[PDB]
């Protein structure tokens, strides 16, 4: 049973082991085939294998619903390299290729083992009789819904087409349904379980957010006499973890505006921590050179706009400081998460001010208004604002920082080992929050 999976994992996919025990558990739950399965794992965590490997071990065919043809083509190309009998039914096909594939699907024992299809195609009149005979001959082993968050108006990429999939899942009652995505809050997950008609109990495999080696804190700029000086000492502590070597590792400072970038770089450089600005304002050549200087550790600190952001990863980022609050919890998570990739201790600090909150609050309304003029209203618009309010709440509440990140994304209470300001000294955080209330 576990041997069949290991055998196929090697002989077909050419892997000695699963990337993670979570990927393994997901894969085994799909193989057993007794439950609907929800897989929520970031890009690169091997989500695809969690349905592709079980598809090869089942007796019948696996249908994979994916929302655009670019995405479909990605895995078809890869599975073909593996000598897997994959097909795609889409309109980027000759009328002849379409008919050849529909004919294959009418066979007792189709050549096709895995079929990739758009939600458009899965509903189209052309396909219904094919789908019906696949049902009738009990040839469907799995229905897979990729990008399952697209069914939710509260996710970032709602698609009406996805609303038909619950009906499809119901008709394919014989077969287990696997739904996958990189991105789902608890509300998006509840929408996925309801709108796709997933059968309870739904087995869930969700990669935790929690980063044990990241120390999170929020500082209130309004309560600090020398903000720039506070930031410099933060940089010094974080870059000072091997004093013998001198300066060790690197850091990112995130800012809202190009001006603030340029200015923060000058202020830091003055105070003894060499920092260079990286933003859309610079010539392409200047950006390549600044990024290079950071990558090769000529310059230890890079100051970037949240808007332009960072194009490249680095293993020894010892700190990420948000000078200005980010636009969303997800943005903050991703930007701060550039820290500590090598697994060594790193520091993530958010410099909060109600003045910054109000600036961003309003800019978000403006960018939402601009989208509403060009394409009308959308429940995503409310999502964008709540995504920011979650981060404001993170800044203004007392409570474990890792716990607040976990709660937003729908993870279990994480094991913070005095790994944030509130868990290290609850009273000091309370002190600072009480002080911020007085400045109101």
């Amino acid at each position, epitope marked *: 049973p576990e041997r069949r999976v290991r055998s196929t994992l090697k002989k077909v996919f050419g892997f000695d082991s699963f990337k993670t025990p979570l990927q393994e558990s997901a894969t085994m739950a799909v193989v057993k085939g007794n439950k609907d399965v929800f897989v929520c794992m970031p890009t690169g965590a091997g989500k695809s294998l969690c349905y592709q490997l079980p598809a090869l071990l089942a007796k019948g065919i696996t249908i994979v619903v994916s929302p655009l043809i670019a995405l479909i083509q990605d895995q078809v190309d890869h599975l073909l390299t593996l000598k897997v009998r994959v097909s795609s039914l889409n309109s980027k096909l000759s009328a002849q290729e379409r008919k050849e594939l529909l004919a294959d699907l009418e066979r007792e024992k189709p050549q096709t083992k895995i079929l990739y299809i758009t939600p458009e195609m899965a509903a189209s009149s052309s396909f219904q009789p094919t789908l019906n005979s696949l049902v009738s001959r009990h040839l469907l082993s799995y229905l897979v819904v990729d990008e399952a968050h697209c069914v939710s108006q509260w996710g970032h990429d709602f698609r009406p087409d996805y609303l038909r999939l619950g009906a499809l899942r119901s008709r394919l009652g014989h077969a287990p349904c696997v739904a996958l995505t990189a991105t789902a809050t608890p509300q998006v997950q509840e929408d996925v379980f309801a709108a796709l008609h997933l059968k309870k109990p739904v087995a869930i495999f969700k990669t935790p957010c929690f980063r044990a080696n990241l120390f999170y804190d929020v500082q209130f700029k309004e309560l600090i006499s020398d903000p720039y000086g506070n930031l410099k000492d933060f940089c010094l502590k974080a870059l000072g973890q091997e004093a013998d070597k001198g300066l060790s590792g690197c850091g990112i400072v995130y800012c809202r505006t190009r001006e603030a970038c340029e200015q923060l770089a000058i202020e830091l450089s003055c105070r003894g921590v060499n920092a260079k600005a990286y933003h859309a304002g610079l010539k392409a050549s200047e950006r390549t050179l600044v990024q290079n200087d950071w990558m090769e550790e000529k310059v230890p600190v890079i100051v970037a706009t949240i808007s332009f952001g960072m194009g490249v990863d680095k293993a020894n980022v010892r700190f990420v400081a948000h000078w200005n609050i980010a636009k969303s919890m997800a943005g903050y998570y991703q930007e701060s998460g550039r820290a500590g990739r090598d697994g060594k201790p790193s520091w993530c600090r958010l410099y909060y001010s109600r003045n910054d909150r109000d600036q961003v609050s309003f800019l978000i309304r403006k960018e939402v208004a601009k989208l509403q003029e060009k394409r009308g209203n959308k429940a995503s618009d409310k999502a964008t604002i709540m995504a920011f309010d979650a981060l404001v709440t993170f800044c203004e509440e007392l409570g474990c920082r890792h716990a607040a990140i976990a709660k937003y994304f*729908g993870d*279990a209470l994480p094991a913070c080992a005095k790994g944030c300001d509130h868990c290290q000294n609850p009273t000091a955080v309370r002190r600072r929050l009480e002080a911020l209330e007085r400045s109101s």
Partner: nanobody
Amino acid sequence: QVQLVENGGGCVKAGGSLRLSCAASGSIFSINRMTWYRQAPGKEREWVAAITSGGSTNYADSVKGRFTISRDNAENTVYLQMNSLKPEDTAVYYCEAYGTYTLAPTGEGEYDDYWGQGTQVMVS
């Protein structure tokens, strides 16, 4: 998975009060709808009261005013305060945990409905 264990049920005189408590065990993140049911001897199950996560409540007409459903968010526990009890209220009371999201720090979880065991309520 999850255990729903109801308590607070006991023999009581008419006009009196009880408070029923249902505790939900396990790695619970959230419960969509929590509903109080009761089963009177030789009657069909009767819907009593429900509370959403969010605290929106609703009551059968036979109990509105007398019964109040509430939640301790901290403890995954719901309460049914019952005042002005009548013989008609004599039943076994159990709770339904509809849309229960469980999840371990490993990232393995479940979405399911759970049913309690029942607590005996006897009104003289």
